[PDB]
Amino acid sequence: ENLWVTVYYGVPVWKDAETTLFCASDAKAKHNVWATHACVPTDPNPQEIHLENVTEEFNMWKNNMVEQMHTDIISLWDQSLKPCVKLTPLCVTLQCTNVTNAITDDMRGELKNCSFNMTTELRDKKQKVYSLFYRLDVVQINNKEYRLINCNTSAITQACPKVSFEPIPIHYCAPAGFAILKCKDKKFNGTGPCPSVSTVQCTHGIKPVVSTQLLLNGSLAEEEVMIRSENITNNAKNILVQFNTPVQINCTRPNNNTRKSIRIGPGQAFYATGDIIGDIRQAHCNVSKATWNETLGKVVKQLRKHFGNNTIIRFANSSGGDLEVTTHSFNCGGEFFYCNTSGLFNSTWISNDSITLPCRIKQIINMWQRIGQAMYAPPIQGVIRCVSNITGLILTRDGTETFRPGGGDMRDNWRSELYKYKVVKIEPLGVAPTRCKRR
Amino acid sequence: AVFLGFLGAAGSTMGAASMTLTVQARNLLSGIVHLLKLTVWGIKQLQARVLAVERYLRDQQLLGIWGCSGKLICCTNVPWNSSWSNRNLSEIWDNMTWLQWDKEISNYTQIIYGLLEESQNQQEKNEQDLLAL
């Protein structure tokens, strides 16, 4: 009856918002391209507070964190490439032959032995030097004259070889007065009201692994194998499936490579591919045919929940596009693999040893956003072999169903890890009536 | 006892959450947010630092122009206009949560913030007129 306004400072109420999210990382110390040394050390006690009775609305497809990580990663690469060697003198006419012929017909042109004139430390004196280049990095002229793949579109820079491409777990954190909300629902769709909710000062460790088709080294579901898309009934919206069991994939570039330093100027050094010690073999990836068949069936079972227990779905290989999107392209040991994937999506399923993936290698990779910039990955010495799990996929429907892979948008990778998070802002001020009066 | 943690009583009743206000009060400025390098992570952190102190003082400023400086629970002289919410006390403090309460009182939140502002400008004018003897 006698009710006055009563002010409360520190009430558990929040609203959705967008904010700058800073990074955290664990102590490990060279320097990676992700600059995780320049982040605040993560707490050895990642405090997670459970929000009893709370139910929040989530929407991983309007989430702002993925739009910020997609830009942070790109800013991390541009920052790390700035002080490295510009390779504009390499955009010069190349005299190329095949390296060590007589193996398997049109697989000796897969990599070339190329010699060219080049600037020295003295601006007036030239040098004829030779290097090995993969076929995916050169084009003809129309004689045995070639040129770098990028010289008509982009300028080129080689990554400083002291920088590591190895992904390091990154923790995104909300500033003081903000919050991260986790959806602890073990069968969460990515959108809609989530029953179990917890708040965290920082997200879990997220390795910024940029892969195609197959999601690598990612986080796993705890039950079933979820499938996430905004409009699944729309064939133009990518399907982000996520396994609960990790299907292991082994990759290797078996050629024992040599890095030969070349002085292209005062203090400027281009790292050419010298020669190959031992056999000239084929880069490839293995994945257990048993586990892949099992895990490919789990996706079929959950794909039925959106298309019917009676319908038939089929897996086919990519339908074209740029090379990065038609193949399982990723980074392994510093070299950029581009793996033909037809041996993984060549299967039709009824209503009710290992397989090997032939991979080619590129060195002059282009930026995925703008045009006019491309990086030269320096050649890695020794033998390369990386071992990782496939934890998800990026599929595409066509409208008997058929599903094929793809997905050249980097933020689809971050969606697969930031789906369970949401950024809100604390509003600790609250007014409410009670029979209390000042003085 | 209980100690639900930071925002732990977000789903609790308004009266129960009104007993754990220091939990959310101390976490409005600390967190984890020593040189200032202007890198992609450095400019990021510097913004996260300045934004936190800004929003903290905006609340403390309103808490000041209402006579509630350094209070978690202050009472005022502004009476409750029933057009804000005709709900009874026992169906608010033992029923609703602070989230849904802010959802329905959000319209008149700017009206209430003005009534408290002049009630404090007039209370301190009366306190001066009383100590003038």
Epitope: N53 | T13, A16, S90, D94, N95
Partner: nanobody, 128 residues
């Protein structure tokens, strides 16, 4: 708001055991108890008992102590404050003297001295 749709009004004969359903909407099913009330024709209205859709803790009158099974399943979130739930009612050593209209009613408040009080009722169901 709040709605509590009840089951059908079908009838059986003594010795049996029937199940009464109560489906809720427009409110958080877990935040209030679920009561079962009986309006017999040859007796004053009787409170049978309430149950917690959150804590699972049930409490019945000693007249129904070992003759009634009360169960509720978990809710389905619709919005941040709206869910859908269900409550079930059973009788064991049943006769024809337990005839009347049966209601389901949710609790009043979430805390205090009148937490479980039957505040929002269903349309009732006719029995044998």
């Amino acid at each position: 708001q709040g709605q509590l749709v009840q089951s059908g009004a079908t009838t059986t004969k003594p010795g049996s055991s029937v199940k009464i359903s109560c489906k809720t909407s427009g409110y958080r099913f877990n935040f209030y108890h679920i009561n079962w009330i009986r309006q017999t024709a040859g007796r004053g209205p009787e409170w049978m008992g309430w149950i917690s859709p959150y804590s699972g803790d049930k409490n019945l009158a000693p007249a129904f102590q070992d003759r009634v099974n009360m169960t509720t399943d978990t809710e389905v979130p619709v919005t941040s404050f709206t869910s859908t739930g269900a409550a079930y009612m059973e009788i064991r050593n049943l006769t024809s003297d337990d005839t009347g209209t049966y209601f389901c009613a949710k609790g009043l408040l979430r805390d205090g001295s009148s937490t479980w009080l039957p505040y929002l009722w269903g349309q009732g169901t006719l029995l044998t």
